[PDB]
Write an enzyme that holds these catalytic residues in place. Structure first.
Site, short mmCIF file in Angstrom:
data_model
loop_
_atom_site.label_atom_id
_atom_site.label_comp_id
_atom_site.label_asym_id
_atom_site.label_seq_id
_atom_site.Cartn_x
_atom_site.Cartn_y
_atom_site.Cartn_z
N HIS A 85 -10.48 5.16 0.88
CA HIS A 85 -11.80 4.50 1.11
C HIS A 85 -12.15 4.15 2.51
CE1 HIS A 85 -9.65 0.57 1.28
NE2 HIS A 85 -8.93 1.05 0.29
N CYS A 101 0.85 -1.18 0.00
CA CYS A 101 0.00 0.00 0.00
C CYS A 101 0.90 1.24 0.00
CB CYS A 101 -0.95 0.09 1.20
SG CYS A 101 -2.45 -0.99 0.99
#
Lengths: 278, 278
Positions: free
Chosen positions: B221, B160
């Site tokens: 998100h 990530c």
């Protein structure tokens, strides 16, 4: 949307609050006189567009055709051979050609390596991206990367605009790109226009509408001698953006050619000559 | 520079303007009932801190020790072996453990590959960066990269927070980081604290003062069932940031251990339980 307005804001910030590199023993010199070419810089800037306009500067003419040729050489031909670019009549990369005519394992060479598995076949970054945008749209991993850590020493130069990430939401294709550094007078207007063209191309061939276009820059710098010209440029009239016509009949990414693009009604300000550093 | 203020602003933007992934056939589902786990998201956000305080949330407790342990495993030990992480008592990566006990050629594995030539020796990204920050401070290429295009298929999970860019200006070391995606509820607070600790470690051993710390996120998100708890967090009282003591006696990046870090006076709100999405 306007690129002239965002560009002017970032330029005024560098001029007013930029940090000089006078503290360092810089390796660039002015070619008119051999003196060290110093810059003013700022860190981490962003330009964002909604795509209601083509992001192109009107306070000076951007070399839009060369921008698209260079884009095709890197993304479509995936070539590291400066001779292919010469054949398109482009000479700006000549200074970097190695003894073998290439720029090393940099740029298009990275986008052409067949290093991804797809359907039991090995494909490159571009074909992989094209497939995934159409078949796995919600992916949080639609990324291309020219900064390959294993091959940096084999590159004649390291890329400035070295990555992209794409997002598909509600039928719209959004593109975010990053440049680790950008000479704001000469390189930035060229690169900003160039990647927006890439977004319009891929959206056409994948079947999506245009989402947002975001251009991030890490080290934003302008050479000190360019400042006078930039100040003139900031006081100029700004025109309406031109229209970019892209041939509608093209359905395959590899079918595009330079004749498929046309800028209509591009009005811009007079030519400013910027002293060469290198 | 409360991280609480900036974090709360991003979360509100997502809850209010975020786009749902209900249009896609998501592959994540809730543990409690097997139903699909959807999210609201926004694209391209940025947090910047001047380092006058430690970026850490006070509206809930962040797992600060675990964050430093995972940081050392990736950047200091440069290991891809989950057993090494288990020895520091951390099990959050066990699910990703492959049959050889590793996560494949991801994370620490990329940081430990000897792929750069320096002074007659082959060195990895971290030693190359440490050398360059001290000896070529003004470089426009102080970048590390875990997104190696040649090895994505050999990774058990793709990172990530995958890249960093460092800048040295006026005796200060600035750090810019990017995550391609971040679960804002669970992952972002842990990741934002963890990279600021890395900034402080590296600045201490290269001899620079602390510059700005910037954290960029591409797909931002939040899972819909996490929304109620986030709404609670947002209305909670905010405290002053804790001070982070780092042992002043460490001069080598490879000498730091977990006992060299201590958060002092960390006050924060009560525990909130967030539903697991598999």
């Amino acid at each position: 949307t306007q690129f002239d307005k965002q560009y002017n804001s970032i330029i005024k910030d560098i001029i007013n609050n930029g940090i000089s590199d006078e503290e360092f023993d810089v390796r660039t010199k002015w070619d008119s006189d051999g003196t060290p070419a110093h810059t003013l810089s700022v860190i981490s800037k962003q330009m964002r567009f909604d795509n209601s306009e083509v992001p192109i500067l009107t306070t000076k003419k951007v070399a839009w055709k060369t921008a698209i040729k260079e884009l095709l050489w890197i993304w479509q031909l995936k070539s590291n051979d400066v001779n292919d670019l010469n054949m398109m009549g482009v000479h700006i990369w000549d200074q970097w050609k190695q003894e073998d005519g290439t720029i090393g394992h940099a740029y298009g060479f990275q986008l052409g390596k067949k290093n991804r598995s797809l359907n039991g076949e090995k494909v490159d970054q571009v074909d992989y991206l094209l497939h995934q945008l159409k078949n796995n749209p919600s992916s949080r991993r639609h990324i291309t990367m020219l900064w390959n850590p294993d091959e940096l020493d084999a590159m004649a130069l390291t890329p400035c605009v070295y990555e992209t990430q794409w997002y598909v939401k509600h039928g719209k294709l959004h593109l975010e790109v990053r440049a680790r550094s950008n000479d704001m007078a000469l390189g930035n207007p060229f690169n900003v226009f160039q990647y927006n063209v890439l977004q319009r191309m891929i959206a056409q061939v994948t079947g999506y509408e245009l989402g947002e276009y975001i251009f991030n820059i890490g080290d934003c710098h302008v050479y000190t001698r360019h400042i006078d010209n930039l100040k003139i440029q900031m006081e100029r009239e700004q025109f309406e953006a031109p229209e970019l016509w892209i041939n509608p009949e093209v359905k395959d990414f590899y079918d595009f050619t330079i004749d498929d693009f046309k800028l209509i009604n591009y009005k811009h300000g007079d030519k400013l000559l910027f002293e060469v550093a290198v």
